[PDB]
Amino acid sequence: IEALPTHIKAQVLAEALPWLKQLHGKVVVVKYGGNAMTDDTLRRAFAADMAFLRNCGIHPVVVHGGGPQITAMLRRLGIEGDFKGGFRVTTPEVLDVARMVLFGQVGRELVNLINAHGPYAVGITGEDAQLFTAVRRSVTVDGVATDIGLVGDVDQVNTAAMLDLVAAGRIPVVSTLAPDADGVVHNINADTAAAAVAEALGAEKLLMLTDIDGLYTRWPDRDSLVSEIDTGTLAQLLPTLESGMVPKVEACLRAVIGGVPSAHIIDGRVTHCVLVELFTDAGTGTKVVR
Template sequence: MNNCFVMKCGGSTLAALPESFFADLKRLQEDGLIPVIVHGGGPAINETLGKLGIESEFVGGLRKTSEAVLDVVEMVLAGQINKEIVRKIQKSGAKALGMCGVDGHLMLAQPVENAHEVGLVGDVVGVNAALIEGVVNMGYMPVIAPIGLGEDGGQRYNINADTAAGAVASHLGVERMIVVTDVPGIMRTVNGEKVVLPSVTKADIDEMIASGEIYGGMIPKVRAALQCIQGNVSEVVIVDGSVPEVLSKVLKEGNVGTRILR
């Protein structure tokens, strides 16, 4: 899959992206570089849970997921957010096909190690790469919502979007994964000023998590990035989606955001 890269984006980030971002996606598709998009949607899930009066909490950056919470997660991610992204891509003139990890057994999952604390949260143990390749070969960008199915085919699992994107990248054998966020990259305070680090290694990240420089929602992002750097995946790039033509800059110039290197 040399003509592909995996792009992970949060649902709230995607909702705020300018039309020029989607025009950039269209240009890349026309140039034969097909993005495989894996998305989240945390804020929209929180909002819907609140409206329905369903309590939800986070444990170590993962949403504690009961069957009731999972119903909402699936409805919001696979329904609302997934279709909103597909509509925006198609409005730009590009071609997209939305699906979730349940469709065609796209993502096989098993309970995470701390399932006793977080409930129905899954780790990806298999990806139907042939299905993604088939969609790409038909000229469509796959847009994937991170819900997985257990090996019995009956139990659904909520999968962290960063973890899901890393697994898709690894199983597809792409060289690069791009994480589109609302921050310019991994930041470090130098002489009282916050600067973006152009590149970091696993040792740098471990040190910055231990010191508290990387915290909150950035921890699962960088941990998933590290998990993803296996097989053919040699780098993960964290970028700010509001930067004009940011994807083209990453793929063609390489001078934007933070690269996490093997």
């Protein structure tokens, strides 16, 4: 990268100014998952990008999944799954394992990676300082609403306490597990939790790290890819998308309808995707507005 003239190194920097000003002093919630989380080079760049934001006076908040890791640990422990539709029933035993893996393993990697750049990252769940609570969610399989155990949605968020942490110059790394109103800890889908914290905290943007270029109208036509779309005409598209796409899209809808100015679905496989989406116009993602 040394053979690039110094006068264009300058212009790409200067073209970040309007987004630097837009984002200065603002909350940005980032849901992190996919291959940006399993490849060492992508995950290092993500950590560095969160340190970037922080050394700009932007306030990143990180929400992480970990689905495959939970599966692998359950298998190492020889815990037999029960399945309704294609969901695993989260028994008390499976919650324990899930909590142990998300907060004790996956979140620790990200904290330590970010903290190679400074004393920034701090891991939390809904359990810590009652930062947020959960309500038992139910799922519908082949038409009928069914219970699949200790799985919930984010209920309410201690907005104030949360915003103090970011003000101290700290980056919350959020494992999505939280008590219900009786203290019973539930596991929350990370895409959903991200949307819910973003709306609670009054975030400026919600970034979705996903394993695709962006939202395709009529997959797999290459002509279908989109830069930007509103909630109205997005929700009208929701019933068509592939199974894996629904969660990333419903979170974008819940967030932007919730008042977040824009939610973004960007390519977690691109190294430094967070930087390209926030500080350049060459975004491969797709932006969502009302």
